[PDB]
UniProtKB/Swiss-Prot annotation, chain A:
It is found in: Secreted, Cell wall. Binds to the constant Fc region of IgG with high affinity. The chain holds residues 295 to 352 of 448 of the full protein. It comes from the Bacteria. The lineage of its organism: Bacteria, Bacillati, Bacillota, Bacilli, Lactobacillales. This is Immunoglobulin G-binding protein G. Sequence repeats lie at residues 4-58.
Length: 58, 213, 222
């Protein structure tokens, strides 16, 4: 139980959500940016702190 | 601790034929032996309870019998429905034990495959990997050989997979996956999938020379 | 109607601890003894615990006693299993089955199962890749599209096509491991009309990382 972030992703093709447990929120998108990379997601990276969620939109 | 011993263990039967399954308790369980059916990955369903009662939705083709130590399940007419595993349990006394399961494979007419190859995804490449895939579907006999010849030369970084029999139309399917790097797949160009099956003398063969548009 | 559904599974560390649950509905929870029954990658069922209707009487399999504790909240109808020394061999598919009343002295009703994996490995979600045919008249009348679900661990992953409105010619191929990461495929073959016309979406779930992602499959249109 370290700190669980979530990535909602609405790309052109891949719409959905994944998750990760991290230290820093800053940590969270470093692996998220990687996860989006691997899946071919490229876009606008916003972020909600009350909800601990990164968004990746195309 | 009662020990439930299931035999044969595996058996293949053409449809409309009879089959018999044996359950053996280590010591008396009177009639407290039930049989469950677990169709290709589904959880188990109750099938026979007591040693001889049919449960909700089992046709009189199924018949269970047995007494203290020896139980048997008789499919009088094997069918495509019946494709599954049959586990047997005794609920006489704790610990409650199951037998090992008996797999029932449907024997049937040979059927040649449908081979499709699919080239790596733009997305796949974005990350620097290239995974080439070929789907050989709905055959019968599960014996098949896929050969991956690169330009028109062959490998080893394949990874194959096989299905359980389709339950309706008693066939199998397969998927071989060739995964090279970006800069590997790259420095190469025609990509083939070759497959002989005893329905064909002549390998079945899947194509594709990289036309990247 | 009797429906049973367990939750709480995922990856655990050897030596660890987890709590499975089972929601009973459409039947009078509390008139029945409940059971836990798990199943490994090879085997058949293995019984784990029993709890009498009122929690007064419980029974354990030798393997799991001193470590697992069965419980139940009749009031809000759910059965439970507190596991506590996870060893690699506690790795199975866990189900909750209902005992049943005479004549049925059989595992009446079964849940769907909740898988639990005990391992040191880190949880890795999957990379979903389309398998587009795109431009090669490939038919009988049928086109064959798929999805590639590579790089995950643990198991399982669940592929459905169009939130399942395509039970049509679906084929999911079991996962093979490469290096602590499984990779599995899923095909569906549709007629010619629809490949592009109609969207074909593969749904992918990976509970351990709670990934639920849809990958629209579009002609790789050159």
């Amino acid at each position: 139980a370290v700190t669980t972030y979530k990535l909602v992703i609405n790309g052109k093709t891949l719409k959905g959500e994944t998750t990760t447990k991290a230290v820093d929120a800053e940590t969270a998108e470093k692996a998220f940016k990687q996860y989006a990379n691997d899946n071919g997601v490229d876009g606008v990276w916003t972020y909600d702190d009350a909800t601990k969620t990164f968004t990746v939109t195309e | 601790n009662i020990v439930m011993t299931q035999s044969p263990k595996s058996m293949s039967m053409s449809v409309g034929e009879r089959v018999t399954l044996t359950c053996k308790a280590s010591e008396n369980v009177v009639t407290y032996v039930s049989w469950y059916q677990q169709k290709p990955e589904q959880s188990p369903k109750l099938l026979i309870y007591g040693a001889s009662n049919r449960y909700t939705g089992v046709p009189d083709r199924f018949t269970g019998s047995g007494s203290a130590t020896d139980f048997t399940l008789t499919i009088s007419s094997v069918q495509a429905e019946d494709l599954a595993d049959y586990h047997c349990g005794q609920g006489n006394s704790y610990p409650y034990t199951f037998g090992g399961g008996t797999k029932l494979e449907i024997k049937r007419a040979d059927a040649a495959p449908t081979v499709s190859i699919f080239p790596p995804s733009s997305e796949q490449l974005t990350s620097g990997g290239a995974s080439v895939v070929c789907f050989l579907n709905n055959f019968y006999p599960k014996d098949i050989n896929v050969k991956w010849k690169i330009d028109s030369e062959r490998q080893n970084g394949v990874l194959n997979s096989w299905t359980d029999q389709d339950s309706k139309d008693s066939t199998y399917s397969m998927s071989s996956t060739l995964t090279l790097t970006k800069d590997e797949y790259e420095r190469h160009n025609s990509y083939t999938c070759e497959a002989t099956h005893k329905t064909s003398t002549s390998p079945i063969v899947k194509s594709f020379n990289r036309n990247e548009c | 109607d009797v429906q049973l559904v367990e939750s709480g599974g995922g990856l655990v560390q050897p030596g660890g601890s987890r709590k499975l649950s089972c929601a009973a509905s459409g039947f009078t929870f509390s008139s029945f003894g409940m059971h836990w029954v798990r199943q490994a990658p090879e085997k058949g069922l293995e019984w784990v615990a029993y709890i009498s209707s009122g929690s007064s009487t419980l029974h354990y399999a030798d393997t799991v006693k001193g470590r697992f504790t069965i419980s139940r909240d009749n009031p809000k109808n759910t059965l439970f299993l507190q596991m506590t020394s996870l060893r690699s061999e506690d790795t199975g598919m866990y189900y909750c089955a209902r005992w049943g009343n005479y004549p049925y002295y059989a595992m009446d009703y079964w849940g769907q199962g909740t898988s639990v994996t005990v391992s040191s490995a880190k949880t890795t979600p999957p990379s979903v890749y389309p398998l587009a045919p795109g431009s090669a008249a490939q038919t009988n009348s049928m086109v064959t599209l798929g999805c590639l679900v590579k790089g995950y661990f643990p198991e399982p992953v669940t592929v459905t096509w169009n939130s399942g409105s395509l039970s049509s010619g679906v084929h999911t191929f079991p996962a093979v491991l490469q290096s602590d990461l499984y990779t599995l495929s899923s095909s569906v073959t549709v007629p010619s009309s629809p490949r592009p016309s109609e969207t074909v979406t593969c749904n992918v779930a990976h509970p351990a990382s709670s990934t639920k992602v849809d990958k629209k499959i579009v002609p790789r249109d050159c």
